[PDB]
Write a protein that binds this DNA or RNA. Sequence first.
DNA 1: GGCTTCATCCTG
DNA 2: CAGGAGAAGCC
Length: 254
Amino acid sequence: PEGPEIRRAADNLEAAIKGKPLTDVWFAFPQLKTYQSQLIGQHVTHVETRGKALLTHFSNDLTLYSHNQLYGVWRVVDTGEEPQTTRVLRVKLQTADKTILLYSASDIEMLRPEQLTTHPFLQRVGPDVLDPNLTPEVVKERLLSPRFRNRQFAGLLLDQAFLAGLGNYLRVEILWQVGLTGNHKAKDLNAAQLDALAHALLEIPRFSYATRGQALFRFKVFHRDGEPCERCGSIIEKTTLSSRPFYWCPGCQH
DNA sequence: GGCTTCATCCTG
DNA sequence: CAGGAGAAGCC
Ligand SMILES: [Zn+2]
């Protein structure tokens, strides 16, 4: 679950409980139990995302921070229901008709307003690819900036200090769209390629966010090793890059 | 900045 | 059951 999936999840959390008084609040972690009585009768005002960090803002200026890493998942249920699962329940936010449940996540903390800028992840993350105010022109400037122009794309496109919300499938899909492998730096691209990359860094995550739940998003190379590339027909390969799986086409990525 | 450790779930 | 599937820890 990368930035598009976490924003889709947050949209669902809002549809379920934004604005509604909380009738029960439960946390598994001992250090969070103190907030349960404090939040009953308060409500979620908005569910903000910054990449894969999810920020559940409450009406008393507290914010729950949660990050699913590789395994956390939210579920929306009718109040009082809890489908059998063997996942460990970590958070429950309950209203009169809907409840939201966070399973399995281990990075969960309660933030004061000041911490929204000083928390170690929140302080480090870059601009979010799903932020509609972020433009291809600003992304181009960021690629060519002294800070990032000498960074290899293999790790750059996983680094949330560069652009928040990119993960491994988006890395693989964006590099294939622009015909590049991971072993390039922005300083070495021509202007056409830099512009293509800046656009793809925003447009592919936005297209996944808009249509993966639903022209619709599809993987061109992720998990398609052994299949022919739909652009050039070469057989897609699986290898490792940056200590993560990597999918690419040897016929049209260079 | 790139490699190894944490963390939970699911597979082969 | 050991190893695969996002970032926080050690230089
Ligand atoms: Zn190809």
